[PDB]
Structure 1
């Protein structure tokens, strides 16, 4: 699966950078088929774009994949620029996405990371400097938007 990790993080970061330029929270993702590297879906946080409580970058990514047979998710990696919250963690667990690759968990880390490992999922934190820099820039410019969301 790891031979698609560069592709997956590059797409996730592109989604985060699209979101940033749209005036949103720079959190992006994509879902890749581990066998052939095909992109099933990609998305970014739509909190500000759509006034959305639930379209986190990971949720938006899964929504953008469309209706799938459940078996499709079982050989995928979900790429996200930021450590997933408990809701997004639960979506990974529920669909049985076996592997989650995380840009960084410096600006945010939920109990979801550990819970994924407890439920038998592989979690890889790449500690990517591009992801940390864009998230830190949003947090510095828009602290009330950030700390009102994550608390």
Structure 2
């Protein structure tokens, strides 16, 4: 779309936030997301961080989202938007780049931001930061109460 928001952007961020809330309720890292087809707004998949729920070192919210979409032909990704409640780390950024997902809509980049946000732009992707306070407050609460668990999720 460029500049103007996609008709499905609010739907996507609301779903990402719902996933983050669910993850928080399950005692995990409150980071969620979803992948939407820009063509019809269909939700290809949705998910949240599964580090605590599955003892996973790779299932960040974004990775879990992609995993939940299942095996897809490469072309499908080319016209989708990945929604994430928090700005992607270098790994999740790499996933978006590898699959060629053209747009990444981010809830906030205040609690966390890696060099990946800019790298996505360098690699030709459109990056949108909403600065969604609901996401920011939820993530901040987790960081406040379980700082070490947050650090573990990003190898800190």
C-alpha distance after superposition, 1:71-126 (max 9, x if no partner): 00000000000000111101100000000000000000000000000000000000
C-alpha distance after superposition, 1:35-85 (max 9, x if no partner): 100000000000110110000000000000001010000000000000001
* Structure 2: segments with no counterpart, 5+ residues: none
1-structure distance, mates of 2:41, 2:149: 35
Q: How does 1:15-94 map to 2 (within 5 A)?
A: 15-94=19-98
Partner of 1:2, secondary structure, is coil
Offset at residue 149 of structure 1 (A): 2.8
Partner of 1:3, secondary structure, is coil
Partner of 1:32, secondary structure, is strand
2:77 and 2:100 in contact (8 A); partners too: yes
User: TM-score, normalised to structure 2's length?
Assistant: 0.95
User: TM-score, normalised to structure 1's length?
Assistant: 0.98
* Structure 1: segments with no counterpart, 5+ residues: none
CA-atom RMSD in angstroms: 0.9
Would you identify which runs of 4 or more consecutive aligned residues in structure 1 move more than 2 Å? 147-151
Give the aligned length.
Answer: 151
